[PDB]
């Protein structure tokens, strides 16, 4: 259903057999059989709207770009992954099988009901979703030939990442990290660690766009200690990723590590706008 008359933005109820419920999805067609752009939300994803629409002119920017914008809604602290145990937070439990939903249910449903090409898509995520995007492309290269990672912890299985992710998950809905990928030594951790699986991005020649601020705010804003420290903190993993990608022979990446930016939406939005033309070219978009 369209949100308003005269505008292309739609709100959808896409059924998810794996999660036993309907997942809300904001959508905007880029035309029949047009490539898809999946925008993943951050750690504190709400159930009403995607952080992308709440905080950015995304839909408006991509209107007529030839790309179909797909914004799933919900999944706080989900990391868009398929969890071992039910996702139990302060507000009860739910089934989290986001990798399944994103790699089969949603694609299929969009192809059949909105004529969205199921392969040759881009998946861009920020914060939590940042590594999710890289990971999705790594295990589903035919579907996602392009992955965008903004301000993410790219080596989640390393150093204190497991503990830090747990602290984050606990503060955002009160979820438990072990319910998702189990204890730190469980194979799930190094499987969902992009820095450790960079070789696949290189082998598959996936178009990679990684972004991360240095912690110093600019005129764009986001000037507060938490936003500054987080950005500075996750930047390290981003550099390690760039070095691994380069060392490994990667030759289809873009690394934007400016001398500014914090962990806030003003920066992620500006970045999503900056990558529009690159996205169109790589996905073969046809304007209008």
Curated annotation (Swiss-Prot):
PANTHER family: DIACYLGLYCEROL ACYLTRANSFERASE_MYCOLYLTRANSFERASE AG85A, ENTEROCHELIN ESTERASE-RELATED. Keywords: Acyltransferase, Cell wall, Cytoplasm, Disulfide bond, Secreted, Signal, Transferase. The active site is at 127 (nucleophile), 231, 263. It is found in: Secreted, Cell wall; Cytoplasm. It catalyses: an acyl-CoA + a 1,2-diacyl-sn-glycerol = a triacyl-sn-glycerol + CoA; 2 alpha,alpha'-trehalose 6-mycolate = alpha,alpha'-trehalose 6,6'-bismycolate + alpha,alpha-trehalose. The antigen 85 proteins (FbpA, FbpB, FbpC) are responsible for the high affinity of mycobacteria for fibronectin, a large adhesive glycoprotein, which facilitates the attachment of M.tuberculosis to murine alveolar macrophages (AMs). They also help to maintain the integrity of the cell wall by catalyzing the transfer of mycolic acids to cell wall arabinogalactan, and through the synthesis of alpha,alpha-trehalose dimycolate (TDM, cord factor). This is Diacylglycerol acyltransferase/mycolyltransferase Ag85A. Its EC number is 2.3.1.122, 2.3.1.20. GO terms for molecular function: diacylglycerol O-acyltransferase activity; trehalose O-mycolyltransferase activity. It is an enzyme of class 2 (transferase). SUPFAM superfamilies: alpha/beta-Hydrolases (SSF53474). Disulfide bonds join 88-93. Homodimer. One of its GO terms (cellular component) is extracellular region. Residues 59-69 are annotated as: Fibronectin-binding. Belongs to the mycobacterial A85 antigen family. InterPro entries: AB_hydrolase_fold, Esterase-like, Mycobacterial_A85_antigen, TAT_signal. Substrate binds at residues 43-44, 127, 155, 233-236, 240, 263-265.
């Amino acid at each position: 259903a369209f949100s308003r008359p005269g505008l292309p933005v739609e709100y959808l109820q896409v059924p998810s057999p794996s999660m036993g419920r309907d997942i809300k999805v904001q959508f905007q067609s880029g035309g029949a059989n047009s490539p898809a752009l999946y925008l993943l939300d951050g750690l504190r994803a709400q159930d009403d709207f995607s952080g992308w629409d709440i905080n950015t002119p995304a839909f408006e920017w991509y209107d007529q770009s030839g790309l179909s914008v797909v914004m799933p809604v919900g999944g706080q602290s989900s990391f868009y992954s398929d969890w071992y145990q039910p996702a139990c937070g302060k507000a009860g439990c739910q089934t989290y099988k986001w990798e399944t939903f994103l790699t089969s249910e949603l694609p299929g449903w969009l192809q059949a009901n909105r004529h969205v090409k199921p392969t040759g898509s881009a998946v861009v995520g920020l914060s939590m979703a940042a590594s999710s995007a890289l990971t999705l492309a790594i295990y589903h290269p035919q579907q996602f030939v392009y992955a965008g990672a903004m301000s993410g912890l790219l080596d989640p299985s390393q150093a204190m990442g497991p503990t830090l992710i747990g602290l984050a998950m606990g503060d955002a809905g009160g979820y438990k990290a072990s319910d998702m990928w189990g204890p730190k030594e469980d194979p799930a951790w190094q499987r969902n660690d992009p820095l450790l699986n960079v070789g696949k991005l290189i082998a598959n020649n996936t178009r990679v766009w990684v972004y991360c601020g240095n912690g110093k705010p600019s005129d764009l804003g986001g000037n507060n200690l938490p936003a500054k420290f987080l950005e500075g903190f996750v930047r390290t993993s981003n550099i390690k990723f760039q070095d691994a990608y380069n060392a490994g022979g990667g030759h289809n990446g873009v690394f934007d590590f400016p001398d500014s930016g914090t962990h806030s939406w003003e920066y992620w939005g500006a970045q999503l706008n900056a990558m529009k033309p690159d996205l169109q070219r790589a996905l073969g978009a046809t304007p209008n």
